[PDB]
Design a protein around this motif. Structure first.
Motif, short mmCIF file in Angstrom:
data_model
loop_
_atom_site.label_atom_id
_atom_site.label_comp_id
_atom_site.label_asym_id
_atom_site.label_seq_id
_atom_site.Cartn_x
_atom_site.Cartn_y
_atom_site.Cartn_z
N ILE A 1 74.63 63.80 101.26
CA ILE A 1 75.02 63.11 102.53
C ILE A 1 76.52 62.82 102.49
O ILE A 1 77.02 62.25 101.53
CB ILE A 1 74.22 61.80 102.67
N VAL A 2 77.19 63.23 103.56
CA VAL A 2 78.63 62.97 103.77
C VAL A 2 78.74 61.80 104.74
O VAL A 2 78.11 61.77 105.80
CB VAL A 2 79.35 64.20 104.33
N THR A 126 78.28 64.66 98.47
CA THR A 126 79.00 63.77 99.36
C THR A 126 80.24 64.42 99.98
O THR A 126 80.96 63.78 100.76
CB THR A 126 79.33 62.46 98.66
N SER A 127 80.49 65.68 99.67
CA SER A 127 81.51 66.55 100.28
C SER A 127 81.01 67.97 100.22
O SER A 127 80.24 68.30 99.31
CB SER A 127 82.84 66.41 99.53
N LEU A 138 71.33 58.16 99.61
CA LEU A 138 72.25 57.83 100.68
C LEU A 138 71.61 58.17 102.03
O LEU A 138 70.73 59.02 102.13
CB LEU A 138 73.57 58.62 100.54
N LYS A 139 72.11 57.53 103.08
CA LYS A 139 71.70 57.76 104.44
C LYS A 139 72.91 57.73 105.37
O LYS A 139 73.92 57.10 105.07
CB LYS A 139 70.65 56.76 104.91
N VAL A 140 72.80 58.40 106.51
CA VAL A 140 73.84 58.38 107.52
C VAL A 140 73.18 58.50 108.89
O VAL A 140 72.15 59.18 109.04
CB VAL A 140 74.91 59.48 107.28
N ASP A 174 77.17 63.88 107.90
CA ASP A 174 76.25 65.01 107.94
C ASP A 174 75.41 65.01 106.67
O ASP A 174 75.67 64.28 105.71
CB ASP A 174 77.03 66.33 107.99
N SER A 175 74.39 65.84 106.68
CA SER A 175 73.66 66.26 105.49
C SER A 175 74.43 67.41 104.84
O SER A 175 75.29 68.04 105.47
CB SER A 175 72.23 66.56 105.85
#
Length: 224
Positions: A1-2, A126-127, A138-140, A174-175
């Motif tokens: 997750i970014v 994460t990138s 993680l979540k977004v 984003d994922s």
């Protein structure tokens, strides 16, 4: 997750990590005590014994309850990125209770409406291209992007009625790699999709593309 934040305990009672060969690989969603929904590309044609599911934890590597796989079934119309779902049967049944629960699914024939707010979660990078990945989930939150806009980004044929898109024009949320197969939910925490594909991660004007639960309920319901 970014662009994400740490998920809290119980945010996604049904989320599972899918390890492969002992390492990070995919996510999934626990549908019932012996069934996981994931992306077909996470599992299709690979040795089944290489996978280990863990439920009930924010980590991939400890906590909660594990299981190996008894079987893998991809969508009967899986081809390229299209119809990117698979049903996994578990060798060990996983009971609900505590921070474990089973997913509730988007209605058959539903389609997420552009502009509505979706939340996606996983243990991926994460990138774009990142090598390291987070220990805890993680979540977004990102808005749904219309299928028309998504077809402007990717081409008409590339985005089907069994996909939907989500992201922001500016990118940055984003994922990414390692998140495939894990859940995207609506604002009610109903499971609307599985992480599927996209052009890089979190790039401006390239949505994440998700396999649509609402579009794929016949397969899910038949084999869950």
């Amino acid at each position: 997750i970014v662009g994400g934040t740490s998920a809290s305990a119980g945010d996604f009672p049904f989320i599972v990590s899918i390890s492969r060969n002992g390492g990070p690989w995919c996510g999934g969603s626990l549908l019932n005590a012996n069934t996981v929904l994931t992306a077909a590309h996470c599992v299709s044609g690979y040795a089944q014994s290489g996978f280990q599911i863990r439920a009930g934890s924010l980590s991939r590597t400890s906590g909660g309850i594990t299981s190996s796989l008894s079987s893998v079934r991809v969508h009967p119309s899986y081809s390229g990125n299209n119809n990117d779902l698979a049903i996994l049967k578990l060798s060990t049944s996983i009971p609900s209770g505590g921070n474990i629960g089973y997913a509730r699914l988007a209605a058959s024939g539903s389609d997420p409406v552009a502009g509505s707010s979706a939340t996606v979660a996983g243990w991926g990078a994460t990138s774009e291209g990142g090598s390291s990945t987070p220990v805890n989930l993680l979540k977004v939150t990102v808005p749904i992007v219309s299928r028309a806009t998504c077809r402007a980004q990717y081409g008409t044929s590339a985005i089907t009625n069994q996909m939907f898109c989500a992201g922001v024009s500016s990118g940055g949320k984003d994922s990414c790699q390692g998140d495939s197969g894990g859940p995207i939910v609506d604002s009610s925490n109903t499971l609307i999709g599985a992480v599927s594909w996209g052009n890089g991660c979190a790039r401006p004007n390239y949505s994440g593309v998700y396999a649509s639960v609402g579009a794929l309920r016949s397969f899910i319901d038949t084999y869950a």
